[PDB]
């Protein structure tokens, strides 16, 4: 009847440790994913810059296969475990049903793994939510969102972690046909959405994008810093 010992239903039925791993992703770094016509974008803020930290090892935008890339929020260690399992699953599926795995299939596998740590008083639930995004073999963009409970609803434009509804409900009124027609136009959408909750500027706003049939390509503060280049893209052409 309490928070306690996952395998218990509340007298209403709110089996609580899942309700808390559900709320465990309210302290992770905000993650955003917007799916365009020919591009899928995946942006994560990093307001733990910790200047003397190697920006490469803390990176949160992981890749699951040639056609699937992943973001998350919450307990990083659980995320690493589930990402390792998902990568092994992608390769195993390509070994037996040889084809690039559908974004649907790997999303369902991750959700099933998350769910399988909800029975069996046993384990504790994974404390992360994932934004599975990628292109499928038939050539269409996808975007998915898992939860510690196991639900895997697929969206068109998402946000998890700190400031969840802030980003999402900003993004309610900004997803349109004239936001996915051209690629950099799609990019500027996610940038502005993250800037709504950003730690005041492009402080390690770890963006990675994916166009059709090529790769995951983490945009990085290049000699041009497309990060900043686009920050004052919007911050010039706002007026």
């Amino acid at each position: 009847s309490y928070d306690r010992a996952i395998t218990v239903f509340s007298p209403d039925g709110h089996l609580f440790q899942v309700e808390y791993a559900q709320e465990a992703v309210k302290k992770g770094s905000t993650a955003v994913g917007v799916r365009g016509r020919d591009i899928v974008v995946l942006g994560v803020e990093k307001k733990s810059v910790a200047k003397l930290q190697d920006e490469r090892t803390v990176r949160k935008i992981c890749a699951l296969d040639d056609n699937v890339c992943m973001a998350f929020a919450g307990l990083t260690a659980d995320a690493r475990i589930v990402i390792n399992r998902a990568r092994v699953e992608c390769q195993s599926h390509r070994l037996t049903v040889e084809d690039p795995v559908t974004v649907e299939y790997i999303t369902r596998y991750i959700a099933s793994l998350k769910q399988r740590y909800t029975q069996s008083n046993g384990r504790r639930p994974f404390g992360i939510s994932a934004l599975i995004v990628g292109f499928d073999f038939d050539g269409t963009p996808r975007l998915y969102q898992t939860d510690p409970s196991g639900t895997y609803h697929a969206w068109k434009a998402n946000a998890i972690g700190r400031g969840a509804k802030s980003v999402r409900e900003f993004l309610e009124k900004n997803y349109t046909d004239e936001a996915i027609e051209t690629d950099d136009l799609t990019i500027k959408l996610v940038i502005k959405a993250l800037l709504e909750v950003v730690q005041s500027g492009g402080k390690n706003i770890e963006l990675a994008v994916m166009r059709r049939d090529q790769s995951l390509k983490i945009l990085n503060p290049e000699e041009i810093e497309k990060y900043v280049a686009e920050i004052e893209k919007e911050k010039e052409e706002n007026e």
Partner: peptide
């Protein structure tokens, strides 16, 4: 819950 959600997913 939100318009951004694909109805077919549910």
């Amino acid at each position: 819950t939100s318009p951004l959600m694909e109805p077919s997913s549910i």
